[PDB]
């Protein structure tokens, strides 16, 4: 669909923060949509990218890829401007075939979304302890 | 024994500090359970590892090993850095014919020695007995 | 400190036993102080040995070590003999710049861990943490 402002609510481990992302246009070379969070100093912004394989008559596999990166700014002595200290990434990839139907893809997506809110993942990501 | 948050109260030299540890799964390679300090960030926090071993063709007796290690953070950049680390480990070694009384006695004896004045003066201050 | 009789109270599983250890001197060849129980036969004693190792060019770390050795005897013959052994070993490592607060924290944390349900189940019942 055509890019639009995306407002996400109830983000955060507390469960109260919100995020508002603005479109940043498509890259013609590889067709990667982009969204960013409003703010000054474009180097300290939260970014989201969405990529989908273009429809073709002879295409075998359809690949959907999503990326997330959140930088943190630390002000240090000897510099007037803040700098990026570390990055927190994410990467979601889906892979279907030409003969798949809509229900399979919707089931996979909803299952992943529900898994990310299960206590197993809430424990394995927030606390970084392996599951055994 | 179920992995669970372990909280230690009234520890430290003064006797007021508390420490709460959170589970971090068990390693499938060597069966070592891990506990990590609640809150904090990785590579800047206290760790505890507990393992229990089975008799095999090399060793004919059980072996329980506990290792605790914790770093000190010093800030000069945005993020802290580790300056030094303090280690400590315990390794009991019982046998297959040992009863529960002996294991409990050894554990309680070790727990009670660390509160004795000898160990207090020989660990806090690094001076031996004379 | 100065070696003297060490008495340990509320020891054992039930928590009503006691134990008194009498000094047995400091070995000059390795600097290991020894505490033993009262008994005529050398092989049936309960021994506690503690040492502190000053840093050298090879190790450049402080190393405090404690050992425990508990034998059990039974008369199968005229006089009892040693059937099995139960061991326990502890060691600490510190750098030259460690403050006494960190060392006390490590000692008290290790003392408090041994009384938690996790260690009680792992050592007494030999149940691995899971």
């Amino acid at each position, epitope marked *: 669909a055509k890019l639009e402002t995306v407002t996400l609510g109830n983000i955060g*481990k*507390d469960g109260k923060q919100t995020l508002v992302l603005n479109p940043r246009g498509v890259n013609p070379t590889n067709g990667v949509a982009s969204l960013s969070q409003a703010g000054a100093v474009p180097a300290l912004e939260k970014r989201v990218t969405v990529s989908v394989s273009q429809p073709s008559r002879n295409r075998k596999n359809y690949k959907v890829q999503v990326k997330i990166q959140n930088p943190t700014a630390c002000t240090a002595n000897g510099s007037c401007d803040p700098s990026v200290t570390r990055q927190a990434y994410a990467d979601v990839t889906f892979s279907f075939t030409q003969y798949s139907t809509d229900e399979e893809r919707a089931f996979v997506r909803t299952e992943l979304a529900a898994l990310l809110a299960s206590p197993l993942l809430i424990d394995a990501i927030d606390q970084l302890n392996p599951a055994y | 024994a*179920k992995l*669970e*948050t372990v*909280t*230690l*109260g*009234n520890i430290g030299k003064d006797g007021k500090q*508390t420490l*709460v540890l*959170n589970p971090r799964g068990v390693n499938p390679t060597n069966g070592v359970a891990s506990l990590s300090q*609640a*809150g904090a960030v990785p590579a800047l926090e206290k760790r505890v590892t507990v393992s229990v071993s089975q008799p095999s063709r090399n060793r004919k007796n059980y072996k329980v090993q506990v290792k605790i290690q914790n770093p000190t953070a010093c800030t000069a950049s945005c993020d802290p850095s580790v300056t030094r680390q303090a280690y400590a480990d315990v390794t009991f070694s019982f046998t297959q014919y040992s009863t529960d009384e002996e294991r409990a006695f050894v554990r309680t004896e070790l727990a009670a020695l660390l509160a004795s004045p000898l160990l207090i003066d020989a660990i806090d201050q690094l001076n031996p007995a004379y | 400190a100065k070696l003297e009789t060490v008495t340990l109270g509320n020891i054992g599983k*039930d*928590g009503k036993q006691t134990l008194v250890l009498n000094p047995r001197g400091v070995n000059p060849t390795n600097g290991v102080a020894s505490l033993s129980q009262a008994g005529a036969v050398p092989a049936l004693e309960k021994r506690v040995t503690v040492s502190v190792s000053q840093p050298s060019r090879n190790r450049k770390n402080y190393k405090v070590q404690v050992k425990i050795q508990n034998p059990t005897a039974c008369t199968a013959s005229c006089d009892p003999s040693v059937t099995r052994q139960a061991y326990a070993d502890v060691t600490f490592s510190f750098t030259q710049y460690s403050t006494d607060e960190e060392r006390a924290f490590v000692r008290t944390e290790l*003392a*408090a861990l041994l*009384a938690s*349900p996790l260690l*009680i189940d792992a050592i*007494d019942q030999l149940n691995p943490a899971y």
Partner: antibody
Amino acid sequence: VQLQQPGTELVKPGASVKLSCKASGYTFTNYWMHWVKQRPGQGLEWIGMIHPDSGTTNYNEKFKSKATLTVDKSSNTAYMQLSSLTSEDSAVYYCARGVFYINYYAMDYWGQGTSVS
Amino acid sequence: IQMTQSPASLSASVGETVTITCRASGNIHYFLAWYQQKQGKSPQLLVYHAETLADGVPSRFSGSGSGTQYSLKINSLQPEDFGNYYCQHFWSTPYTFGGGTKL
């Protein structure tokens, strides 16, 4: 060392309630906080515990959906949000302060408790 | 681990000693506490290690037992000692309470 509680409150079915709390006389930072429900004539039940340092909750495997626990860092306050109230589970809710010293495991300084219709 | 109290109702009025027993489905290594609730609906703390005692307790209360069987003992019962008694364990996560017993 005492724990203030707002007192009895009345709410219509199918709503959510805050169950506020206040801690005084001690550092709120160090100690756990338990929540206990007592149905009149049915005995005590354990809801869960929370750690003020970082939100580290434990739950009964019951009340998972019904109860959620949060604490604000300053003002020494604890909360207990009940998502759905059919008013069938009308009871008195306490908030004890958990203590976990060596060979000393208990809940002391319980508090007055609040009744919810 | 499930805790249960055997009597669930006791009528001994004054003077005579009383006992309250407890059972656990698993082995808890003395991690047990006893609570007393009067008509004020705010429980107090007792014993807290199945053998020790709290600060305000007049020592007429005493507990014992090991393994999976525990008990509470009262000597020279006095009129103010009337109400409900609950027990719980501290060995695993649920920290389940007991059934309760009324005097």
